Amino acid sequence: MLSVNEIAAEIVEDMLDYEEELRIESKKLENGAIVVDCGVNVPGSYDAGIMYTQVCMGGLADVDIVVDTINDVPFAFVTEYTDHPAIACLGSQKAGWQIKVDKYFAMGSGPARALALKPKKTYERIEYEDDADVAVIALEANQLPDEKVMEFIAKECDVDPENVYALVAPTASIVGSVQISGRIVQTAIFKMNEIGYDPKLIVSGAGRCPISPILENDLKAMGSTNDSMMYYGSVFLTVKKYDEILKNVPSCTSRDYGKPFYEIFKAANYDFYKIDPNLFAPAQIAVNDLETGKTYVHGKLNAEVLFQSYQIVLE
Amino acid sequence: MLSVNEIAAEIVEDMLDYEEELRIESKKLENGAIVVDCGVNVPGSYDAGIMYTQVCMGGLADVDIVVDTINDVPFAFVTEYTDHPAIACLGSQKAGWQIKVDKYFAMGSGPARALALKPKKTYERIEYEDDADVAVIALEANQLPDEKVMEFIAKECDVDPENVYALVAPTASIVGSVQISGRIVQTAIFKMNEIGYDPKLIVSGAGRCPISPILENDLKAMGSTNDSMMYYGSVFLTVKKYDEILKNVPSCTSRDYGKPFYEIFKAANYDFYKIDPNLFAPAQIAVNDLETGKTYVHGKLNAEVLFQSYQIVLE
Amino acid sequence: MLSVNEIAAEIVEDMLDYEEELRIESKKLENGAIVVDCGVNVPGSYDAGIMYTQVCMGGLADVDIVVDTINDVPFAFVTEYTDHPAIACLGSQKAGWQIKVDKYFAMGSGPARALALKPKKTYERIEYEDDADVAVIALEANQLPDEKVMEFIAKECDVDPENVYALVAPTASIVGSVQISGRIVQTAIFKMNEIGYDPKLIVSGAGRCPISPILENDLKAMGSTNDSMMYYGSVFLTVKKYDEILKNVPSCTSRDYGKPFYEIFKAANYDFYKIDPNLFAPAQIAVNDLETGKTYVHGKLNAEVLFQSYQIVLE
């Protein structure tokens, strides 16, 4: 068995060895839980961003940064791949756990999900459950969790609070930008399962996605980081059997596609904050069908929307 | 001295530590030989593909995967380089050892070739021979070799069978796609030597090549993996002294160039050749000549043929 | 505290463990100094080039090579990033120490600069000084340093000569090409400071730059290596507050921009005092401002001049 919590815990332990290099800071709480600040009150780093992503993917993925250009403008990009996309992306990475402890709220991502079984149906659909006595969660938040939050996470995971780790970074931070574009494979996997395709048919996935510049607040960053994937995220996927339904994976097949997501979200304040869930999806995919030996291409890139998203100013 | 077998054996031991993660499986045979299935009865993985390639290159190259686009369509790519091209590519990686042990027949690649001296003339040309008590062979085949096959390989290498490793993957597998695109440097070096250029004059080489989707059988995969290098593989090379003959390195200088190789292979009826041997060659090269300080560029990319080879289906 | 000397010493120790593989040679002098030839009387290698660069950047950066294309022609590229740009690039990588010991001339880069404080004002500007009893220097020289040269470096750094390491390569070598394209982030950071922008405001930098072919002598190589960055070097940087003056970062804003540096230098009668110092600068930058959330783009790529510089011969 592959234990996403045990594998990710090793990477957290590595982060703990290089805190200053990585520009992160941890604290051991009075109940023994370890809270790793990756960008709330510290700058974080590109490499902290990478490691946060690897942790989110339960250590079952390759994640690297390469610098390249869009229409000549240079950006850092995530390039990543995994041969365990159902476990890495659905059973671990997806921010699928609503943590609510009195007044704290955060969406939880990462290996701890596979212990708490959050949400229940995901683990049934992918046929995975972790068995570990360590739990590792990643939180996107502008506040660090305290002893009571960590206690709750540990009880939900059936682990002692001394054996729980949390990585935390806000949306608008380097680690936020890296870890969100680092979801490019996930967006594909999750959208495929959402439209009815069995994620157990997915053999592997490989993805490229620009890392958003850091915008001036968490709400703008929510927009540009989602946009990295929706307008400029590319995925090569391998599956056992193709289904024609996969034409509906790309975000351009959503009624809500066309503007930066920040603009979509602002416009929705006037309609009960409702937005097509299918919008959250990769820009372009190629699907290599093992049955027929054909590779079906769907979607499109959109540098023009991306540059609006990114608040690019040209001369 | 650099021992391609000893260096590669360290890589194989690493594979053995991460079998489940890499989606491979090994067996230690009665005679002690270690046989590592990388894609016959197991899925393998992008990372097993990289390690298989590193092993073929006698651990004397860098091999990585980077996601990128061809006419907007995303693919995984091999990016690779080596400062021992003669030894890594000709003395090791090239599939130059025909293994036929009555019923079992495979083409053998990798460091074992440098103990068995297969073929003889290669090792005289590059002035290399390995001295090691361990042998590592990579087999492109759809069956795992038994005690008798490994005893044959051991004997040819003058190594006890308990000190022999074999990596095995079929042509149509992820390891097959990665490892064959991984020969991008090798194809250039091999073609250079074939047209009479002394490979001992080659200082280093760096290459990029897309990783073929997996087609529906080994025969179709033979075509598309080869096409990756012939129609879309690029190599930057450094040489001590340039020769005008190097203009005939690229595949497009062959009389047989122009159709997906599968069509070429079963359009002159055969199961080889006359097919022009010179066809097996990189698409495009830049050769930096240390003597004159100039860099000569030859060849061209053909995405149109690659997309045919790859059985791409656009909307 | 981050000690650039102690961190870089670990990398040098890793180089010493793989000399034959990296094609380098070291010698321990009679005073105990360790001189590592990366390219004077040995070929060096792509990997020795990467480690040389990592050392120049005090172990505080990531540096990798990818193969990609410029107008179809393949080159090896450096991709790199750092979350300590002031220390890694100003405090360490910049070749800011002029060494003259009798008739021996060398340019000193890397972590020993942060002990000798060469030049004084840089360390005041970035508010960094190292404390280490090991010194690590990188020398761009066409001759290996002897006992007397190493004694001078040791005394300037207040270290015992037995605790000094030097890496050495000439401009025209693979290491020299890799390491100079390896200065792509540095050239942006240095240029910023030179035009009056406080390097303490710079959060991080990421850059890409092609690696020059090796030209026929050090003079030519000085030209093509510089041109790599000036004509085809791209950087994405993040800063605390923008300043309109950053429009003047790219080389194209220099009065001397436009032809290969070798031609500029010849036309100046080999006198840098006759060349605009603001020429030494990246080709194109994108500057993400944390204050406004905007990303400002400046500069341009120039493949035509690059290909002249590189002494490219097309068919």
Swiss-Prot record, chains A, B, C:
Annotated compartments: Cytoplasm
Keyword vocabulary terms for this entry: Cytoplasm, Hydrolase, One-carbon metabolism
Thermal activity characteristics from the UniProt entry: Optimum temperature is 85 degrees Celsius. Requires a high salt concentration for optimal thermostability at 90 degrees Celsius.
Pfam families linked to this entry: MCH (PF02289)
Gene3D superfamilies reported in the protein's UniProt record: Methenyltetrahydromethanopterin Cyclohydrolase, Chain A, domain 1, Methenyltetrahydromethanopterin Cyclohydrolase, Chain A, domain 2
Domain of life from the UniProt record: Archaea
Catalytic activity: 5,10-methenyl-5,6,7,8-tetrahydromethanopterin + H2O = N(5)-formyl-5,6,7,8-tetrahydromethanopterin + H(+)
Enzyme Commission code: 3.5.4.27
Function in brief: Catalyzes the hydrolysis of methenyl-H(4)MPT(+) to 5-formyl-H(4)MPT.
Protein name: Methenyltetrahydromethanopterin cyclohydrolase
Encoding gene, per UniProt annotation: mch
